[PDB]
Amino acid sequence: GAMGSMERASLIQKAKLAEQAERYEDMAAFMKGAVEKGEELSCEERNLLSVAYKNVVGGQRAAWRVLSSIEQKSNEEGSEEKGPEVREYREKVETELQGVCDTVLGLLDSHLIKEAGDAESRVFYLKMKGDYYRYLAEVATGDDKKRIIDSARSAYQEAMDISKKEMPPTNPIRLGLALNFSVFHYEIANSPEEAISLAKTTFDEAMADLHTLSEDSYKDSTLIMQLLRDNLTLWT
Amino acid sequence: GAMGSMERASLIQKAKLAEQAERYEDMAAFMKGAVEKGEELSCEERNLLSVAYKNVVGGQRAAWRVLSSIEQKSNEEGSEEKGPEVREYREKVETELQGVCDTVLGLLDSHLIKEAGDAESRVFYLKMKGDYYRYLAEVATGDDKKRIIDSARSAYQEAMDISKKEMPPTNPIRLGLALNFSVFHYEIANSPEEAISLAKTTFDEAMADLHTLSEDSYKDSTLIMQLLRDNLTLWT
Amino acid sequence: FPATV
Amino acid sequence: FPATV
Ligand SMILES: N=C(N)c1cc(-c2cccc(NC(=O)C3(Nc4ccc(Cl)cc4)CCNCC3)c2)cs1
Ligand SMILES: N=C(N)c1cc(-c2cccc(NC(=O)C3(Nc4ccc(Cl)cc4)CCNCC3)c2)cs1
Ligand SMILES: [Mg+2]
Ligand SMILES: [Mg+2]
Ligand SMILES: [Mg+2]
Ligand SMILES: [Mg+2]
Ligand SMILES: [Mg+2]
Ligand SMILES: [Mg+2]
């Protein structure tokens, strides 16, 4: 690792600096280096890791979607043959995206998940595992597409099972997990009814638990609840 | 060059795709590959090259400014020693910025400028040379700072001399050159009066030539004129 | 595109 | 920061 000679604390400090500078590729590289020190991550560190790679892959996904749309248009009946270039460049971005997802999944498998025993860490990492298999599923087309989808489903399901046993319904990790698993159902699994049911049940169970919360926790939970409602409005 | 095996036309096509996907590092790499084919660039191709690297270095400059500001604050009397990390990471971004500028300057020197005989190409490239020495000057602090500033000045001045001889006062390249040279005077050369005089004279001479223009050319020229006015408003 | 976090 | 193009 190019970060192997840097102190763990220095890597975390630089990840925070990279975030302020909106240098998310650097942020992800720093946080990868921190993970590879082998120690468990704190709550703040887990979120630094997630923010970094979410921003990197989010940009890749946005670019892939633009290029896929151009490619599909170039292949419609009536278009001018524009050569292999659009496909080639879409493939290049796709391969880079898959590489980032494989990197994150590799960090989770070696060895973040196996050492994560507390609900807040284990659910967080299993949600990430579901998320990065979901991004792989968004671009998958071959012999392994079904297996990628099932890997996302399985990770999300284990996270859900733990979250329902160990966290209150307003816990923001539980809410964000359900938000994303609901999107998985809608966009990946072709299961819009499951997506809607999950979002609605999650929202209602959180609503009924808000009375237990401080003002700051209320803000955290209701922000994610609004995203659930936003998706339900999109879908119904 | 990693692009040496790709067709020139394919590189240009992919630069355009990268632009649509907001993948400006890729765009710059494609356009570097196109330049390195050794043929002169068309007007469209020159602008693809400029857009790509302007976006790349613009992001680097923005990040450098954030990090420099954090570093200066960490060094004020009363701060908590935060170790070498802020300086190290600012230096890393700075070195990457300098590398991008050196790359662009290298393309201009090998061999875009020496083959550029038409005013529209030669002024454009000399403006770029001034711009990328200006970005180097923004971060320069050592034995060569004065020489970097004079290299920017000299490139801008040769571009100005050609533009005044060979282009009308409303030509958008001439206007954009004067806009940027005026900023060089204000921000780099500590010559605010020169910056203001140049912006004002450029604006007034363009105003008096607008009557010669088509509706589309008028739009192009007045857009840059508005930027001159915007800067004059900032500065007076 | 739907919201995720 | 001033405008450049
Ligand atoms: N960016 C940094 N430097 C740091 C961030 C945190 C942190 C630590 C804990 C929680 C958060 N909440 C978030 O990020 C947001 N909610 C969220 C909820 C569930 C999940 Cl599973 C993921 C996200 C993201 C979307 N809008 C609302 C806040 C952030 C510590 S440091
Ligand atoms: N992005 C692409 N794919 C392509 C762009 C062009 C092109 C070709 C010619 C001119 C432009 N004008 C510009 O870009 C803008 N003016 C400008 C003026 C002087 C300079 Cl020296 C530089 C810029 C940039 C700022 N706002 C107004 C337009 C663009 C051909 S292709
Ligand atoms: Mg150590
Ligand atoms: Mg592929
Ligand atoms: Mg259920
Ligand atoms: Mg050829
Ligand atoms: Mg330096
Ligand atoms: Mg003068």
Which tokens in the block code for residue A213?
A: 């919360």
> What's the rounded Cα separation, in Å, for the pair B109 and B105?
6
Task: Give me the domain span that covers residue A163.
Answer: 8-235
Residue A230 CA neighbour count, 13 Å, CB half = 14
> What's the rounded Cα separation, in Å, for the pair A156 and A140?
18
Decide if A100 is inside a domain. yes
CA–CA distances in Å: residue B113 to residues A71, B104, B128: 36, 12, 10
> What's the rounded Cα separation, in Å, for the pair B227 and B220?
12
> What's the rounded Cα separation, in Å, for the pair B61 and B67?
10
CA–CA distances in Å: residue B96 to residues A43, A56, B58, B101: 32, 19, 12, 9
> What's the rounded Cα separation, in Å, for the pair A84 and A81?
9
Decide if B1 is inside a domain. no
Peptide bond into A111 cis (omega under 30): yes
SS3 for A81? coil
Q: Contact at 8 Å (CB) between B45 and B12?
A: yes
Which tokens in the block code for residue B34?
A: 């196109």
| The 3-state secondary structure of chain B, one letter per residue | CCCCCCCHHHHHHHHHHHHHCCCHHHHHHHHHHHHCCCCCCCHHHHHHHHHHHHHHHHHHHHHHHHHHHHHHHHCCCCCCCCCCHHHHHHHHHHHHHHHHHHHHHHHHHHHHHHHCCCHHHHHHHHHHHHHHHHHHHHHCCCCCHHHHHHHHHHHHHHHHHHHHHHCCCCCHHHHHHHHHHHHHHHHHCCCHHHHHHHHHHHHHHHHCCHHHCCHHHHHHHHHHHHHHHHHHHHHC
Chains D and B touch (3+ CB pairs under 8 A): yes
> What's the rounded Cα separation, in Å, for the pair B131 and B152?
7
Nearest CA in chain B to D4: B180
Q: Which helix (H) or strand (E) holds A11?
A: helix A8-20
User: Angle at Cα A123 formed by Cα A118 and Cα A126, nearest 5°?
Assistant: 125
Q: Contact at 8 Å (CB) between B9 and A84?
A: no
Decide if B19 is inside a domain. yes
> What's the rounded Cα separation, in Å, for the pair A184 and A191?
9
Distance of residue A178 Cα from the nearest chain C Cα, in angstroms: 9
How many separate domains does chain A show? 1
Decide if B199 is inside a domain. yes
Picking from A41, A30, A43, A42, the residue whose alpha carbon sits closest to that of residue A4 is A30
- CATH code for the domain in which residue B45 is found: 1.20.190.20
Place of tokens 């690297």: B53
Spell out the residues 6+ positions from residue B99 whose beta carbon is closer than 8 angstroms to its own. Answer: none
For helices B145-166 and B119-139, give the axis angle rounded to 10 degrees.
160
Which tokens in the block code for residue B88?
A: 């190290």
> What's the rounded Cα separation, in Å, for the pair A233 and A200?
11
| CB atoms inside a 10 Å sphere around CB A110 | 12
> What's the rounded Cα separation, in Å, for the pair B123 and B116?
9
> What's the rounded Cα separation, in Å, for the pair B64 and B45?
29
Q: Contact at 8 Å (CB) between A197 and A191?
A: no
Question: E strands along A1-64, which residues?
Answer: none
Interface membership of B183 toward D (CB under 8 Å): yes
Decide if B166 is inside a domain. yes
SS3 for A117? coil
Spell out the residues 6+ positions from residue B198 whose beta carbon is closer than 8 angstroms to its own. Answer: B178, B181, B182, B185
Experimental technique used to determine this entry: X-ray
Decide if B3 is inside a domain. no
The 8-class DSSP code of residue A169 comes to T
> What's the rounded Cα separation, in Å, for the pair B202 and B174?
9
> What's the rounded Cα separation, in Å, for the pair B33 and B18?
14
Nearest CA in chain A to C2: A231
| CB atoms inside a 10 Å sphere around CB B56 | 21
Spell out the residues 6+ positions from residue B70 whose beta carbon is closer than 8 angstroms to its own. Answer: A17, A20, B86, B90
Decide if B206 is inside a domain. yes
Decide if A1 is inside a domain. no
Distance of residue C1 Cα from the nearest chain A Cα, in angstroms: 9
DSSP A180-204: HHHHIIIIISS-HHHHHHHHHHHHH
Q: Contact at 8 Å (CB) between A85 and B17?
A: yes
> What's the rounded Cα separation, in Å, for the pair B19 and A63?
10
Residue nearest to atom 10 of ligand 2 (CA): B47
Ligand nearest to the CA of B127: 2
Which tokens in the block code for residue A6?
A: 């840097």
